[model samples]
Target: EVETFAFQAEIAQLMSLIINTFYSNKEIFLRELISNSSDALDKIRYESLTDPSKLDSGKELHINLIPNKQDRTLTIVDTGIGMTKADLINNLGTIAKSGTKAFMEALQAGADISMIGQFGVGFYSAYLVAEKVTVITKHNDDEQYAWESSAGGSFTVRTDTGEPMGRGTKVILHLKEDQTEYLEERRIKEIVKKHSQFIGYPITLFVEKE
Candidate 1:
């Protein structure tokens, strides 16, 4: 049901370095992930200009933070432009060959200063708090795919056999047992307000009632 691939040489070393150096201040993981979602949302907006069919699935775009205390998983879901299986392998699997980076460069040449901050590698920051990460994504152009990694040397990718994901990405972080603080709704809201309040799209935190 899945295919396994090793992390690129530099990324393997860098992941180790990132965990060791950034562990002291791991709250930034949320900010980084949220920033990524904002970029994805913006990407869909921009692409829709050239290919309006991209928005045919659903016009609404937003980010949702869902904390599952029972499972100790925090999911960051975005209704943004999703990725194909190739994008999952190339963009998420390899660090330096990011298609997102190339897109940013294209915008910079046109002098769109707002698109200057596209940092494609910040997704790795999820390792700061998650023991394992699972990404389930669907793009209108391709079938649904899932990528999973345990912050280890190798990761797995598979064509998801579950029900269809309408669009965009769902990043599910299997929080380390000691990192349960991230599962608190208040904590997530604070992080979003502190770092991503300026984001152009609506970001909602799901709260389960008793």
Candidate 2:
């Protein structure tokens, strides 16, 4: 079933700010996403300490970056704690309630833009480089779901019937025409090496050998 919802008004405001004002440092989008993946991985590990069965998926804990130039897309996959449908709506839909309002106000006033990560709104940074963002996630406790948005106004959440993705989250960025730099493996490696070098899990960028 596909269900669509509007972004909280404040979240819509933040998206406009990110796409217009944050273009100068668009590369940081990758940094923000990698940090998010690391956080998710950390969460799953912590939860498994109490419920050992959570690790039953047996998927290695890591991150993978896959760039498809033909499709003009870049995907980031993490074997970590995935979000259920409710989590997606509450966390991603109504994000304005969770300190994101404050972040938006600060950004508007030209102050402390770095607070995005702290406020858990870093995910919106994807709009800087992508016209559309798609998230496919599977939590051990729920069925696979896909959440997609163009940051135009609203987002949709639906069941994903593709091949089983196991346990984790996959974020696909549909790059804008001028944002092709992210589709280059070399550029991606440089960004990761520069920003996410110390991430706890392995971050691998797939390279096609010619």
Candidate 3:
């Protein structure tokens, strides 16, 4: 089942924060993605205790960073709880809460903005460098699906059979023309250690040692 919707009114406000505020570093993008992955892993692992068959029965929960300098792409792959069809629509395509208004208020006041309460909008931070973001995910009861967007306030969700990930999600960041420096393995490791050092699951980076 494929569908689309008008983004929430606060989508502009969130995008502004990503484009204008978070420009100095790409670490925040990775930070939020890693944080979300850990939470996803936390949920399925906990849910499995009672159900025993959530997503993957018992996979080692971890996140993999795959960067390709040739393609100018950085993918965040996680073996964590993925998303349902509804989860893809509600959580990624729109605001799950009214935190948008508060975000706008903070924006007008020039207050320090944080990714804490605004939820899925925080996921929009990928726009800081990515011209397009692709989320390929698998849910326990839903098919492996793909959601692609340019952070332009609207997106599409459809069935995916291309790349296999077993369970969890792969967030692909297609780097912008001017933002290709994020593909550097050395810089990425530095930022990962700084932001994701104490994260629950292991953080693995696949650097081609040429």
lDDT of 3 by residue, 9-41 (tens): 566556656766644655577787888888888
What is candidate 1's CA lDDT for residue 122? 68
Cα TM-score per model: 0.85, 0.93, 0.87
lDDT for each residue of candidate 2 in 171-201, tens digit (9 for 90 to 100) = 9999999999888878988899888899989
- Per-model CA lDDT versus the true structure: 0.78, 0.86, 0.76
**In every candidate, how many clashes are there?**
0, 0, 0
The collision pairs in model 1 are none
Alpha carbon deviation, residue 133, candidate 2 (Å): 0.3
The digit string of per-residue lDDT tens for model 1 on 7-117 reads 776567546755565236677788778888888889999999998988988899999999998888999999888888887777655655453456345644773322223
Candidate 3: count the clashes: 0
**So what's the TM-score on candidate 3?**
0.87
**How good is model 1 by TM-score?**
0.85
| Deviation from truth (RMSD, Å), model 1 | 6.1
Q: What is the alpha-carbon lDDT for the whole of candidate 2?
A: 0.86
